[PDB]
Amino acid sequence: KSHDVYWDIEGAVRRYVQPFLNALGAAGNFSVDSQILYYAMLGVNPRFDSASSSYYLDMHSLPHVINPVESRLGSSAASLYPVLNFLLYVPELAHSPLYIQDKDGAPVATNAFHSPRWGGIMVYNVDSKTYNASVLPVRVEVDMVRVMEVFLAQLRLLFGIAQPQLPPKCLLSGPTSEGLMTWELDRLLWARSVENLATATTTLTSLAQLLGKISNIVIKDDVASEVYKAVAAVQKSAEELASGHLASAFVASQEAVTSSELAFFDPSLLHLLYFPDDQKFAIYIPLF
Amino acid sequence: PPRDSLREELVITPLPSGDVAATFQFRTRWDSELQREGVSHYRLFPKALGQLISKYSLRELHLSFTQGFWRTRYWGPPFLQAPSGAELWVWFQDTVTDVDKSWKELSNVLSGIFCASLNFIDSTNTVTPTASFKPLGLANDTDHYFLRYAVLPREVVCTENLTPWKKLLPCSSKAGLSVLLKADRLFHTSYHSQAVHIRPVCRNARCTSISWELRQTLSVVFDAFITGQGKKDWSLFRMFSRTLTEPCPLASESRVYVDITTYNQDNETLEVHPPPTTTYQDVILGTRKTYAIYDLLDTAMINNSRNLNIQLKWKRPPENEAPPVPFLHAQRYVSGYGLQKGELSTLLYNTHPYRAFPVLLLDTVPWYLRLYVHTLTITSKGKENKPSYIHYQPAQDRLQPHLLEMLIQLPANSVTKVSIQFERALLKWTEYTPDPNHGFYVSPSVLSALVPSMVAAKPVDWEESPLFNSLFPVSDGSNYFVRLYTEPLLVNLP
Amino acid sequence: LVAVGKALEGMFRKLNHLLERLHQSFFLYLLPGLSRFVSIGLYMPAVGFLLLVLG
Amino acid sequence: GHTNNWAVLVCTSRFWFNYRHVANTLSVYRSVKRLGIPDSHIVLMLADDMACNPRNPKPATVFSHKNMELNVYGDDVEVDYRSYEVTVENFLRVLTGRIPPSTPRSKRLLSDDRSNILIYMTGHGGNGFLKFQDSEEITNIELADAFEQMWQKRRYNELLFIIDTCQGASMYERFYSPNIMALASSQVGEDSLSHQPDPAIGVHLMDRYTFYVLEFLEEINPASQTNMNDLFQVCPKSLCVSTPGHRTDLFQRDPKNVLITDFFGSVRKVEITTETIKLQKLMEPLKYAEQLPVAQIIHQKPKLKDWHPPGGFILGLWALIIMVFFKTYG
Amino acid sequence: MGSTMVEEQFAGGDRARAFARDFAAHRKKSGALPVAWLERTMRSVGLEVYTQSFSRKLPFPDETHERYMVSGTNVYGILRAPRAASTESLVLTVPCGSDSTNSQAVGLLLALAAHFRGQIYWAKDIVFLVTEHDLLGTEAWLEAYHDVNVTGMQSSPLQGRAGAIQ
Amino acid sequence: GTTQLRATATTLILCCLLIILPCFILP
Ligand SMILES: *NCCOP(=O)(O)OC[C@H]1O[C@H](O[C@@H]2[C@@H](OC[C@H]3O[C@H](O[C@H]4[C@H](O)[C@@H](N)[C@@H](O[C@@H]5[C@@H](O)[C@H](O)[C@@H](O)[C@@H](OC(=O)CCCCCCCCCCCCCCC)[C@H]5OP(=O)(O)OC[C@@H](COCCCCCCCCCCCCCCCCCC)OC(=O)CCC/C=C\C/C=C\C/C=C\C/C=C\CCCCC)O[C@@H]4CO)[C@@H](OP(=O)(O)OCCN)[C@@H](O)[C@@H]3O)O[C@H](COP(=O)(O)OCCN)[C@@H](O)[C@@H]2O)[C@@H](O)[C@@H](O)[C@@H]1O
Ligand SMILES: C[C@@H]1CC[C@@]2(OC1)O[C@H]1[C@@H](O)[C@H]3[C@@H]4CC[C@H]5C[C@@H](O[C@@H]6O[C@H](CO)[C@H](O[C@@H]7O[C@H](CO)[C@@H](O)[C@H](O[C@@H]8OC[C@@H](O)[C@H](O)[C@H]8O)[C@H]7O[C@@H]7O[C@H](CO)[C@H](O)[C@H](O[C@@H]8O[C@H](CO)[C@@H](O)[C@H](O)[C@H]8O)[C@H]7O)[C@H](O)[C@H]6O)[C@H](O)C[C@]5(C)[C@H]4CC[C@]3(C)[C@H]1[C@@H]2C
Ligand SMILES: CCCCCCCC/C=C\CCCCCCCC(=O)O[C@H](COC(=O)CCCCCCCCCCCCCCC)COP(=O)([O-])OCC[N+](C)(C)C
Ligand SMILES: CCCCCCCC/C=C\CCCCCCCC(=O)O[C@H](COC(=O)CCCCCCCCCCCCCCC)COP(=O)(O)OCCN
Ligand SMILES: CC(C)CCC[C@@H](C)[C@H]1CC[C@H]2[C@@H]3CC=C4C[C@@H](OC(=O)CCC(=O)O)CC[C@]4(C)[C@H]3CC[C@]12C
Ligand SMILES: *[C@@H]1O[C@H](CO)[C@@H](O[C@@H]2O[C@H](CO)[C@@H](O)[C@H](O)[C@H]2NC(C)=O)[C@H](O)[C@H]1NC(C)=O
Ligand SMILES: *[C@@H]1O[C@H](CO)[C@@H](O)[C@H](O)[C@H]1NC(C)=O
Ligand SMILES: *[C@@H]1O[C@H](CO)[C@@H](O)[C@H](O)[C@H]1NC(C)=O
Ligand SMILES: [Ca+2]
Ligand SMILES: [Mg+2]
């Protein structure tokens, strides 16, 4: 009713998000989409101060912000890949000057926060120059560069890439256009390959132990083929990591993880419910 | 210039039996190429439903969750009718290859979206109509190889299904007519249907371009004895436990239509306590109907200083003033007794005094009710009737249901009986439902017809007409299309 | 008449509480009283003993 | 040391008179939703619908108290599995991850290694089995094996198996995987008993064990530091006629040091971001389809001709017959 | 049925008596089962009233019931269960015969129908059937309802059914 | 409470095995 928010999300994605994810695409495939959620309310009511005439979200109240909005966000039932939600919150006219405070109680410069493995939320306050007019709703054309800087920094922090730790008496180069330096991508790929190989090894060991312990698990030819592919891929990935080829090692580890997960989580493994062993005499005695 | 717009409306029609029926519609039209991958920025149009069109090659998607059965004879023709339980019929694009695989994937995704057990849609439920369920939007060609229709008659609809449905609207029950959707009041009804319709429509009057429309509808019928309890006075507050306060800011049109036509009185109208913004008359469902419009976007009607509570005075009309029975209605039942054999008999009533019109009967019977097509008899006025077009596919045990489509010509002022014999089948002890003595539901039959109209209807503009008048394409001025669904049938197996 | 109507209303409400056809209890029985019954497995010997004479 | 919480709430009763179990599951669902667990991390499985059951005197409402005080079935309930898809096989697939590939993300338990998982199961049980919809049973051995598979795949950090049924202690007699602590409403020889008979609604609203679990959880806030011992002491023999039981040998941590919030709630970790990335006219119109094209419908199917056997077939049959006739008659 | 309980709220004991007096007077006036009055009163109480006309010729005159050829009409109204499709049914029938009896039964049936009509907790349709010629009307109605011609009774086709009777 | 499906070993297996073995084989 009081805000008419228009954002050039298409141009922002084309100019910043897509080049960033093209740089970051060595770790996998990325899907980008946007939505405008009307009447989406933060759970906690901001606290008011009579002095600064602005409303605040205390640090202890931050964890409860992202739970109510997730219901409106949904479930994304189309795909099962991990989802990273980056919300841009425009405060209502009731608490228009909304500011997030840190532990020390000072306002956050970026006015945003991020949650591990979930995403980030940025509070977008609107300038009073737009409010100078008494007519409502006022047109809000958000600034995409300022929002996207925070969102891409949060993406980097979420994906494990942190601030480079300079050795003593060292000078690091300026940021690139994409925002990611290539050697950081190499570290991320090393970590991804190692984690994928460890996950595949654990999955295969658990599958073998499950087969040993439980004797009513059905192993189909497809499951056997996937297990063989996973074992071959794990051995190849270990060999290439020993050799030094990170791209081939990463591809082999990805294939190993995919094959091991397909083999272990096949619905065909669970075929029939348990038949009691203390009731088979009623099945075999009467005729045989 | 935004490329999408939202129109919402609520039509309140008093029924001939003294009940009051209210139908919500929230139409969102988008001028985007959702059929091709790349549309990733959603406003108004829900993202949850937008990505389906591109992910699975879709042309038209129709989903309905319904409680109760529309009593056509006593309630009059409906704007929109749906079978009991879940109903999902979809139209895949010609570019698709594995229609059944996309059907299964889409059914599971829709189950996840709407919190309904739509994963039970299998080959045993799915049918491919040959002449029924034509596309409801713009269609270059009609190849039924790309059509799938499934119905789950035992599916229930509750708040668990209404909340995802309400969360797909832009206002999301915070403003507009969506605030009237109270779960307690909506299910305290004789009829309740939640529908989601996706189809392509003309972008402009020239209709040279494709625009995508989403129509979310909710139809309820309030009983005169349960809700009224002898009050004999209707109101928005008395119906929804809530009064309208503000229109949806996103909507470019939010109006309330109240039917005020008196069929017996000489040009008189029903009484509405607040004066309507305007009065609109047009040929809806074959009869000249007068509507009172409450434009919620007008400050002179509703604003921040007052709420809107539309009060309508309606009681069951006397026998003399009762409207004539609709020209087409049907009932379905099971003939015989025991647990060995029976008959699925359908009665098709043509009440028109002198006009005979064709009808299209669609029957889908599960595999355990083995049908004998040589026993199919269609007797109208006591003599054999030969259907113009008959298509029958036999069921395969645990793999296919029976499908039987007929194009029957109903003679004027007659009742046509369509009966086919079946033998109940004994299943394995693990193939029964947890309640095996309750019975098995036979899916409701679908009746498509072009019912003649009392007066001729002028060509209508879908962008300048009420949303209840643009549900079905109109081809002839003197005929309108109705899709009746009969009652579900409960049969017991040995 | 109010008491009779209350009994009928209670009977019909409890019947409405049924979620499936009546398959429990028994269908073949003899009633030596309003609240007593004899099932088929307990009165069948009466006929069987008489048929043993014929056999 | 956990950072993730999941909850699977299962009602295994499929008839109207079993209103207690649906009310129990919905009450636990509301408790864990207040305590901060997202609905996307809750796999709520209800065997039957009671809110919109046609026999419900108050439609679209499930009530927890005798005088219609609290409606657990509100307006933000997410029922993932309902009606006939709540079965033993489906529950085992949800637990062990061996779910059909087309199952949406809503109906999956995507729990990691660091995840504490709460399993609430109410229904009709017996000596070592819990009946699912009065047609199938999940034995203690089957549940133990499923939890063992979950442990070997390392998909739960710690598991809290709450069961509200007759002879509820018999279900966890065969548990052998570590980091599992189980709660029962009754011992192996006792029976779970109902609570709050409501004539107006017409059924029994809730069970004593779950009612008092809710009552104990109504005093629980995110700041609450209540240990699992106080949960073990809820509903003594004075109130619950059956005596509740538990096992904690499999759990590797002392229950006095385990907070109830660790299983019944999740608070999100929030980090203030202080970093920036420093960016720089078709002539032919379109037409709607005709809804009932009778003329096209009649002629789309080719003319029906009466079936007759092939001339080649009848000729071959007669040739064989006459060949045999001559081979017999000379 | 054993794990549930019901709180009866039937208070229409005077409506039943008034209906009984009206039905008795109209039956006396008509000389048979009053069809018009029954169909008007069922509409008034809110049922979905129907009428079936049956006929039969007995093999020989029946001295006890004083009938040779029997012609009658069955009046029944269906209480369509809200919140459910017409799939199940419960029948409350009054066997009415030419004996100046069961008027109180008819009145109580109509009062029960009036009480039941305003409720929402019905999962099954309720059929309030007022037969004619004692069990002959019941047999004709059942044969027509199930579409089985077991005894050779003649009857008009049924126009309204309430699903599978339970 | 309820009853799981359990075989009636004493009632039926013994009867239907002693109807075969002593009737035909052993004596
Ligand atoms: N909260 C808490 C809760 O509670 P609680 O606490 O827990 O508690 C409660 C609970 O409870 C419950 O409980 C449970 C339940 O249950 C329920 C259920 O239900 C159901 O079930 C049911 C059913 O239905 C029914 N049916 C029944 O059935 C039965 C069964 O089951 C059983 O098992 C049994 O009984 C059966 O039977 C049997 O088995 C039999 C067999 C054995 C024996 C055999 C024999 C041997 C041999 C013989 C002899 C030898 C030979 C030689 C000689 C010489 C069954 O029964 P029935 O069916 O009824 O029937 C029987 C039969 C039939 O019949 C027969 C007869 C025949 C005819 C005739 C014959 C022929 C004759 C010939 C002629 C003569 C000749 C002449 C010559 C001479 C000349 C001069 C010389 O059957 C059979 O099989 C039989 C057999 C056959 C055999 C053989 C053949 C014949 C003959 C031979 C002989 C002789 C001849 C020759 C010669 C002679 C002479 C010569 C000189 C030398 O059962 C039940 C009941 O019980 C179900 O469910 P439903 O619903 O259905 O479904 C569900 C799912 N879906 C189940 O499951 C359930 O469980 O409850 C109860 C109660 O109920 P009631 O209702 O009340 O009751 C009813 C009754 N009816 C209880 O009990 C229980 O426990 C629980 O569970 C819960 O629920 C609750 O909760
Ligand atoms: C002589 C010539 C030759 C031919 C012939 O004649 C001519 O020979 C004759 C002769 O040969 C006949 C046979 C003789 C032997 C007969 C055996 C008989 O079975 C026994 O029948 C008994 C009858 O009193 C008991 O069964 C009870 O039967 C009642 C009805 O009559 C039920 O009402 C009750 O069950 C009810 O269940 C619900 C509870 O709430 C109630 O309180 C309880 O009353 C049953 O009893 C139940 O029977 C069950 C078995 O079916 C369980 O045993 C159960 O026990 C419960 O078990 C629980 C754990 O599982 C426990 O927790 C609980 O406390 C217990 O109560 C037990 O209550 C008993 O029981 C059961 O065995 C069977 O019916 C018929 C039978 C074959 C006969 C058939 C006909 C014949 C061939 C005749 C035939 C013509
Ligand atoms: C109609 C005429 C047609 C004729 C056609 C004939 C064709 C068929 C003829 C013969 C088929 C033989 C079937 C039975 C053989 C062994 C079955 C068995 O005991 O399974 C035990 C059950 O445990 C128990 O409960 C045992 C209690 C009683 C055992 C009965 C003894 C019968 C042995 C002799 C019978 C006769 C054999 C030789 C006879 C000299 C243990 O087995 P299991 O591991 O639990 O089961 C898992 C199955 N896999 C995974 C192992 C595969
Ligand atoms: C001489 C020429 C022919 C003579 C006889 C011909 C005609 C005989 C035909 C029918 C007579 C057989 C009677 C049927 C027996 C029915 C009993 C029965 O079904 O009981 C049921 C249970 O039965 C059983 O458990 C097993 C029954 C085995 C029956 C075996 C004996 C039957 C016939 C034997 C001989 C009959 C007479 C012979 C004399 C010549 C139901 O039990 P319940 O009481 O409801 O439950 C209580 C707790 N369980
Ligand atoms: C011409 C005449 C001689 C016919 C001979 C009669 C027999 C056929 C009868 C006489 C005694 C009967 C038996 C009496 C007792 C029992 C126990 C009964 O088992 C139970 O107690 C029920 C168990 C259950 O319900 O699971 C099963 C039938 C049986 C074997 C009966 C089978 C039929 C028998 C052998
Ligand atoms: C049941 O069958 C009987 C006999 O087959 C039918 O009786 C005939 O009814 C017609 C009118 O429909 C009369 O013209 C005949 O004279 C009757 N014949 C006899 C022998 O009675 C009866 O109509 C059938 N009932 C139904 C409902 O179909
Ligand atoms: C990313 O997408 C491309 C094109 O759809 C596909 O070829 C590629 O395999 C995908 N990457 C992975 C890791 O699946
Ligand atoms: C609109 O607001 C004005 C100012 O409060 C009020 O006077 C007027 O009555 C309102 N409109 C209607 C239709 O009441
Ligand atoms: Ca969920
Ligand atoms: Mg039963």
- Nearest residue on chain B to C24, judged by CA atoms? B437
Q: What single-letter amino acid sits at B7? A: R
User: Is D27 within a domain?
Assistant: yes
List beta partners, residue D227. Answer: D259
* Helical H segments across A214-245, by residue range: 221-243
**Separation of alpha carbons D282 and B207, rounded Å:** 9
For residue D314, the distance in angstroms to the closest alpha carbon of chain C comes to: 54
Nearest C-alpha neighbor of A27 from the set A192, A261, A274: A192
**DSSP at A39:** T
Enumerate neighbours of A (3 or more CB pairs within 8 A): B, D, F
Q: How many CA atoms lie within 13 A of B384 on its CB side?
A: 4
B437 is in an annotated binding site: yes
Q: What single-letter amino acid sits at A143? A: D
**DSSP at A94:** T
**Separation of alpha carbons D50 and B158, rounded Å:** 10
**Separation of alpha carbons D161 and A92, rounded Å:** 43
Q: What single-letter amino acid sits at D108? A: R
Its domain, for residue D72, covers: 6-257
Mutation target for B interface from E87, E122, E124: give the one with most B CBs within 10 A.
E87
Cis peptide before D199 (omega within 30 of 0): no
For residue F6, the distance in angstroms to the closest alpha carbon of chain D comes to: 12
Answer left, alpha or beta for residue B289, where phi above 0 means left and psi between -120 and 50 means alpha.
beta
CA dihedral E34, E40, E42, E48 (to 10 degrees): 120
- Nearest residue on chain E to C4, judged by CA atoms? E108
Q: Per the structure block, which two tokens stand in for B93? A: 């694009």
| b/e per residue B206-244 (b: at least 16 CB within 10 A) | ebeebbbbbbbbbbbbbbbbbbbeeeeebebebbbeebb
Enumerate neighbours of B (3 or more CB pairs within 8 A): A, C, D, E
Q: Does E18 touch chain C (CB under 8 A)?
A: no
List beta partners, residue E49. Answer: E77
**DSSP at D71:** B
**Residue A227 — φ and ψ, nearest 5°?**
-65, -45
Cβ pair D72, D23 in contact under 8 A = yes
Residues of D in contact with C17 (CB under 8 A): 16-17, 55, 202
List beta partners, residue B422. Answer: B342, B371
Residue keyed to tokens 């295994």: D12
Cβ pair B167, B204 in contact under 8 A = no
Helix/strand/coil for A210: helix
**Separation of alpha carbons A176 and B337, rounded Å:** 82
Count each helix (H run) and each strand (E run) in chain C, helices first.
Answer: 2, 2
- Nearest residue on chain A to F9, judged by CA atoms? A282
CB contact under 8 A, A153 and D101: no
Q: If you measure from the C-alpha of residue B274 to the centroid of ligand 8, how many angstroms do you get, rounded to a whole number?
A: 14
**DSSP at F11:** I
**Separation of alpha carbons B77 and C2, rounded Å:** 41
Cβ pair B91, B97 in contact under 8 A = no
Helix/strand/coil for B284: strand
Nearest C-alpha neighbor of A125 from the set A92, A90, A74: A90
Q: Per residue, what are the HEC states of A175-208?
A: CCCCCCCHHHHHHHHHHHHHHHHHHHHHHHHHHH
Distance of CA D106 to the CA centre of its chain: 12
List beta partners, residue D194. Answer: D207
**Separation of alpha carbons D125 and D132, rounded Å:** 9
Nearest C-alpha neighbor of E80 from the set E58, E104, E51, E113: E113
**Separation of alpha carbons B492 and B187, rounded Å:** 29
- Looking only at the bridges linking them, the beta strands covering B147-152 and B41-42 are unpaired
Helix/strand/coil for D273: coil
Number of other CB atoms surrounding residue C19 within 10 Å:
17
Task: Classify residue D248 by burial, with Cβ atoms within 10 Å: 0-12, 13-18, 19+.
Answer: middle
List beta partners, residue F15. Answer: none
Q: What single-letter amino acid sits at B31? A: D
Q: What is the DSSP string of E105-135?
A: HHHHHHHHHHHHHT-S--SSEEEEEEESTTH
CB pairs under 8 A between A and B: 49
Enumerate neighbours of C (3 or more CB pairs within 8 A): B, D, E
Helix/strand/coil for D138: strand
CB contact under 8 A, D59 and B120: no
Q: Does D312 touch chain E (CB under 8 A)?
A: no
Cβ pair B392, B162 in contact under 8 A = no
User: Is D282 within a domain?
Assistant: no
Number of other CB atoms surrounding residue F10 within 10 Å:
8
Q: Could you tell me which residues come within 8 angstroms of residue E31 by beta carbon, excluding any fewer than 6 positions away?
A: none
* Helical H segments across chain D, by residue range: 19-34, 88-96, 140-152, 208-217, 228-232, 261-264, 294-300, 311-329
- Looking only at the bridges linking them, the beta strands covering D4-11 and D42-46 are parallel
Q: Per the structure block, which two tokens stand in for A170? A: 């060292």
Q: Does A286 touch chain F (CB under 8 A)?
A: yes
CA Rg, chain C, in Å? 18
**Separation of alpha carbons D86 and D102, rounded Å:** 17
Mutation target for D interface from C9, C18, C19: give the one with most D CBs within 10 A.
C19
Across the interface, of A32, A36, A74, the residue whose CB is closest to B48 is A74
Q: If you measure from the C-alpha of residue E153 to the centroid of ligand 6, how many angstroms do you get, rounded to a whole number?
A: 7
- Cα A5-A10-A13 angle, rounded to 5 deg: 115
Q: Could you tell me which residues come within 8 angstroms of residue B67 by beta carbon, excluding any fewer than 6 positions away?
A: B84, B156, B157, B187, B191, B192, B193, D52, E83, E84
Q: If you measure from the C-alpha of residue D31 to the centroid of ligand 5, how many angstroms do you get, rounded to a whole number?
A: 55
Q: Per residue, what are the HEC states of D178-217?
A: CCEEEEECCCCCCCCCEEEEECCCCEEEEEHHHHHHHHHH
**Residue D181 — φ and ψ, nearest 5°?**
-125, 130
Q: What single-letter amino acid sits at D203? A: V
Q: Does D57 touch chain E (CB under 8 A)?
A: yes
- Cα D100-B146-B128 angle, rounded to 5 deg: 80
Nearest C-alpha neighbor of B48 from the set D120, A72, D200, D273: A72
**Separation of alpha carbons B182 and D68, rounded Å:** 18
Distance of CA A3 to the CA centre of its chain: 30
Cβ pair B490, E163 in contact under 8 A = yes
Domain count, chain D: 1
User: Is D13 within a domain?
Assistant: yes
Helix/strand/coil for B335: strand
Helix/strand/coil for B353: coil
Cβ pair A111, A125 in contact under 8 A = yes
Cβ pair B36, B57 in contact under 8 A = no
Sheet strands side by side (includes B253-259): B147-152, B85-92, B58-67, B191-202, B210-222, B20-30, B4-14, B253-259, B287-295, B278-284
**Separation of alpha carbons D270 and D272, rounded Å:** 7
Element (H, E) at B128: none
Cβ pair B308, B236 in contact under 8 A = yes
Across the interface, of E87, E117, E147, the residue whose CB is closest to B335 is E147
Q: What single-letter amino acid sits at D251? A: F
**E strands present in B31-175:** 41-42, 58-67, 85-92, 147-152
Q: What single-letter amino acid sits at E65? A: H
Distance of CA A286 to the CA centre of its chain: 59
User: Is D104 within a domain?
Assistant: yes
Q: Please give the span between the terminal C-alpha atoms of chain C, in angstroms, as a whole number.
A: 56
For residue F12, the distance in angstroms to the closest alpha carbon of chain D comes to: 23
**Residue B127 — φ and ψ, nearest 5°?**
-130, 160
CA dihedral D131, D137, D143, D144 (to 10 degrees): 110
Mutation target for B interface from C21, C22, C23, C27: give the one with most B CBs within 10 A.
C21
User: Is D326 within a domain?
Assistant: no
Residues of D in contact with F4 (CB under 8 A): 126, 129, 131, 137
Helix/strand/coil for B450: strand
Element (H, E) at A14: none
Nearest C-alpha neighbor of E102 from the set E10, E24, E163, E2: E24
Residue keyed to tokens 């002693």: F18
- Looking only at the bridges linking them, the beta strands covering B414-424 and B369-380 are antiparallel
**Separation of alpha carbons D149 and A213, rounded Å:** 10
**Separation of alpha carbons D175 and B473, rounded Å:** 63
Cβ pair B181, B218 in contact under 8 A = yes
**Separation of alpha carbons E160 and E76, rounded Å:** 9
List Cα–Cα distances, A212 to A208, B412, D154, in angstroms.
6, 74, 17
Nearest C-alpha neighbor of B20 from the set B232, B208, B275, B267: B232
User: Is D314 within a domain?
Assistant: no
Number of other CB atoms surrounding residue E99 within 10 Å:
8
Q: What single-letter amino acid sits at D161? A: F
Nearest C-alpha neighbor of E10 from the set A251, B49, D46, C4: C4
Q: Does D74 touch chain F (CB under 8 A)?
A: no
**Separation of alpha carbons D135 and D132, rounded Å:** 6
Cβ pair A78, B111 in contact under 8 A = no
Q: Could you tell me which residues come within 8 angstroms of residue B457 by beta carbon, excluding any fewer than 6 positions away?
A: B282, B283, B286, B474, B477, B478, B480
Cβ pair B259, B14 in contact under 8 A = yes
User: Is D194 within a domain?
Assistant: yes
What would you measure as the largest C-alpha separation in chain E, in angstroms? 51
Helix/strand/coil for A91: coil
D39 is in an annotated binding site: yes
**Separation of alpha carbons D263 and D282, rounded Å:** 63
Angle between the N-to-C axes of helices E103-117 and E13-30, in degrees from 0 to 180, rounded to the nearest 10: 130
Element (H, E) at B294: strand B287-295
Q: If you measure from the C-alpha of residue C41 to the centroid of ligand 2, how many angstroms do you get, rounded to a whole number?
A: 7
Cβ pair A33, B42 in contact under 8 A = yes
- Nearest residue on chain B to E166, judged by CA atoms? B438
User: Is D102 within a domain?
Assistant: yes
Q: Per the structure block, which two tokens stand in for B110? A: 């829709």
Nearest C-alpha neighbor of E126 from the set E158, E83, E166, E92: E92
CA dihedral D288, D290, D296, D297 (to 10 degrees): 130
**Separation of alpha carbons E41 and E37, rounded Å:** 6
Cβ pair E10, E115 in contact under 8 A = yes
List Cα–Cα distances, B238 to B20, B23, B209, B229, D54, in angstroms.
12, 16, 44, 11, 22
Q: What is the DSSP string of B81-110?
A: ---SEEEEEEEE-TT-S-HHHHHHHHHHHH
Cβ pair E100, E29 in contact under 8 A = no
Number of other CB atoms surrounding residue D284 within 10 Å:
6
**E strands present in chain E:** 48-62, 67-79, 88-95, 125-131, 154-155, 164-165
**Residue E73 — φ and ψ, nearest 5°?**
-135, 135
Which atom in ligand 6 lies closest to the alpha carbon of residue E56?
21
Count each helix (H run) and each strand (E run) in chain B, helices first.
Answer: 6, 25
**Separation of alpha carbons B343 and D298, rounded Å:** 27
Q: Could you tell me which residues come within 8 angstroms of residue A229 by beta carbon, excluding any fewer than 6 positions away?
A: A255, A256, A259
